[PDB]
Structure formats: structure tokens, C-alpha cells
Amino acid sequence: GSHSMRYFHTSVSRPGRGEPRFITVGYVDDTLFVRFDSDAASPREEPRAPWIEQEGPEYWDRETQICKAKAQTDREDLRTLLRYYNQSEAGSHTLQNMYGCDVGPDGRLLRGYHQHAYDGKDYIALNEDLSSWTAADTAAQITQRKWEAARVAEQLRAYLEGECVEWLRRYLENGKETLQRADPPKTHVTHHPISDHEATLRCWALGFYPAEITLTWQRDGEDQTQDTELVETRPAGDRTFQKWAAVVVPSGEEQRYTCHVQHEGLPKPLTLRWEP
Amino acid sequence: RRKWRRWXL
Amino acid sequence: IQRTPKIQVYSRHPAENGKSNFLNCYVSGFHPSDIEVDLLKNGERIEKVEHSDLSFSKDWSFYLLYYTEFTPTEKDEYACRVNHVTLSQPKIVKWDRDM
């Protein structure tokens, strides 16, 4: 089906305590597979998924060299940003970047990405054409001119249209047994009295993959999203996710409420109700 | 695998 | 910009008293990334706690999963304590096996 590969990076300056902290992780779909943390004597990128451990030493060597180079460039970039914004070296700042690609079922590129954020806000991002830039403010406009003059877009586009897609296809085949398998959610409805006149109906979805899913509560077939409490999809810690939706109903109306679950791992949408 | 970034903002 | 963290404390599997499980504390939607998270057992800090590597969402806000192996009972009380620059005091969310 449709898949993606994403590399996330975060550098945080640490005034008076040492060099900035640099942490980067790579994901294929919702599966984390590589990590690098600068907080070590001799840090190296490490595997986080079984299907990537088979890569040879040259792979880890190159990845580690790239990670170390990115940490250094980030340190220089943080210094540049302090000048662009006339900020003091005594304050902590954060620089984030994410880049990756999406491939359709045919294995061909669907969309590429490359975007930066400074202090949690959009800084500069590569447009969908993978050839032009969108700057968020005057400071990012300085970077844009520099990147336009240095033909940065064409270099990123070459990587995003080539290696990004080619290596994503490689990982998808090696991890086929898990990355190309959708784990349907295990579902059930729980009942929790709030008083003698009201009760909470909670619809659960557990151990599912990927993370995308839709949970809705209906009363007599009418969507109750306005009165539905929906928690953010959360990780179980075993690579699968969990989510639940709840509604408060007047005691005695419970059997009129049905929970609707939609997940790519389910052949058809599921309808569930409280079964005491 | 990752892309190379040697210099850069 | 600074954003306060959302906090969810839950078990990896439905709680069954006397059976080993994993106690999770998911913190998300926060900025800056400096955060202090602790898992508590009857008000005391648990020491065998691991955590995922810092990552972030589409809106650049960060998220982290803190977890530890535990064996729930009917008497023991569990909680997650989070301190962030956006909180004037640590925030304690008690573990509810029904959430």
C-alpha cells in the first residue's frame, strides 16, 4: 500500500552546561527503526526495528558519520539563528528538521518533505514541487536566498526522488512480515457508573497498527462527536497503539449507543455495544 | 538511509 | 512558544491483579523538550523506568513514552508525575485501570 520514511532531528542548546543536545530518529510508517543521541562518549546510530539490524557495518558507519555531521551543522545553525534574531547566547533554543518521502502502492514517489522549525515554530519548508521554498518570516528569508543561490532544492529533490524512495522500498521488503501487515484492533465496550443516574460508556481499540483509526459513538444511529471524549492515540510500547472514545449517557439508555470502529486492518467497519 | 548535509542556515 | 504537555498513564495490557504488565506514561504536545517524568508507586519514585527517544508531531510539539514493568494489585496506587517549564508545580496523574 501507501508508505513513508521520515527522519526527525532536534538540537537544543544548553547554555553553560555543554554542547547542544542532538537527537534524531527515523521511522518507516509508524515503526521507529533507527536512533542517534549525541549524549555519549562515542555515539553511533543504533537499530530500533529487527528488519534493519541486517544492514552491514558500512551502513551503520555512514549513518553515524552523517548523524555526527548533522549535529555539528545544527550547532553552527543555532549560532546563526541567534544572530538573525539578535538573541543572547545565555538562552536555550531549539532547532528541528524533518524530511522524508511517501510512496504509493506502485512504489513510486507520491510526495517529498523537508521542513525546519525554530523554537517550535515554522521556519522554512520545501514546497510540494520539491523545488521552491516557503519562508515563515524575514529571518527565514535570509536562509531562502542562501539556499536558492546554493541550489539546495535541486539537491534535496534528487535525494527525495531517488535514494529516499529506493531505500524505503528496500526496508519495506525486508520488513514485509510486519510493515506490510495491518494489525486490526481488539475492541470492547466497558461500562462505568458515575452515579445512580448516569454512566460512562467507553469504547476501546487495542493493539492495532498502523496508528490511523476512527472511533465514533452513535445514539440511535446519530453521531455524538460533540459529546464524545476522544483521547489521543497512544503507543502500547510493543509497536502497536491504543485509543478509546467515551460518552456519558443517562442510565437506561446504554443499549441505544453503538461504537463504530474503522481501521485498515478490518475488512468492514465494526459496530459494537455494551454487552453486560 | 539518510541524506548527506555537510554545511548549512 | 511553549506548550504544556498532555499526560496519559495506562497499562500496556488490561490490568489483571497479580500478573506482570507494563505501566506507561505518554507525554505529548509539549515545547520546549526539557521535561522530567517519573512513575510513582504509592507516592514513591520507581527507579526501573525507561523512555523512548525524543520525537515530535506535525505541529513540532514533542512526545515521549516512559514505561516500566509492573504487577498491579488491588492495593497499590500508581501515578505519573510530570514537571515542565509550563507548570508551576509538578502535575500528578493517577493511574486508572479503566482509562
Author numbering:
A (entry chain A): 1 to 276
B (entry chain C): 1 to 9
C (entry chain B): 1 to 99
Sentences from the paper on this structure:
Major Histocompatibility Complex class I (MHC-I) molecules present peptide antigens on the surface of nucleated cells for immune surveillance, allowing CD8+ cytotoxic T-lymphocytes to eliminate infected or cancerous cells. The repertoire of peptides presented by major histocompatibility complex class I (MHC-I) molecules on the cell surface is tailored by the ER-resident peptide loading complex (PLC), which contains the exchange catalyst tapasin. Tapasin stabilizes MHC-I molecules and promotes the formation of stable peptide-MHC-I (pMHC-I) complexes that serve as T cell antigens. The F-pocket of MHC-I, which accommodates the C-terminus of the bound peptide, is critical for MHC-I stability and peptide binding and displays high allelic variation.
To better understand the peptide-editing process of MHC-I, we investigated the dynamic properties of MHC-I in complex with a photocleavable peptide (pMHC-I), and then followed the changes upon UV exposure by NMR spectrometry. First, we characterized the dynamics of the human allotype B*27:09 in complex with the photoRL9 peptide (peptide sequence is listed in Supplementary Table 1) by 1H-13C multiple-quantum Carr-Purcell-Meiboom-Gill (CPMG) relaxation dispersion NMR experiments. Indeed, we could observe a relatively large number of methyl-group containing residues exerting conformational exchange and these residues are mainly in the binding groove and polarized towards the α2-helix side of it. UV exposure of the photoRL9 peptide results in a 7-mer and a dipeptide fragment. Mass spectrometry analysis showed that the 7-mer fragment remains bound to the binding groove of B*27:09 after UV exposure. The melting temperature Tm of the cleaved B*27:09/photoRL9 was lower than that of the intact pMHC-I. Thus, our data indicates that the release of the C-terminal dipeptide fragment in the F-pocket upon UV exposure turns B*27:09/photoRL9 into a peptide-receptive state, featured by structural and dynamic changes in the binding groove, especially changes in the F-pocket region of the pMHC-I. In particular, signal intensity of F-pocket residue T143 is significantly attenuated, together with other F-pocket residues N97, A117, indicating that tapasin-induced altered F-pocket dynamics similar to the features seen for the pMHC-I molecule devoid of the C-terminal dipeptide after UV- exposure. Unexpectedly, residue T143 was also affected by adding ERp57-TsnL18G, which suggests that this mutation in the loop does not significantly affect tapasin interacting with pMHC-I’s F-pocket region, although L18 is critical for the catalytic activity of tapasin. It is well known that T143 as well as Y84 form essential H-bonds with the carboxyl group of the bound peptide in the pMHC-I and we also observed these two H-bonds in the crystal structure of B*27:09/photoRL9.
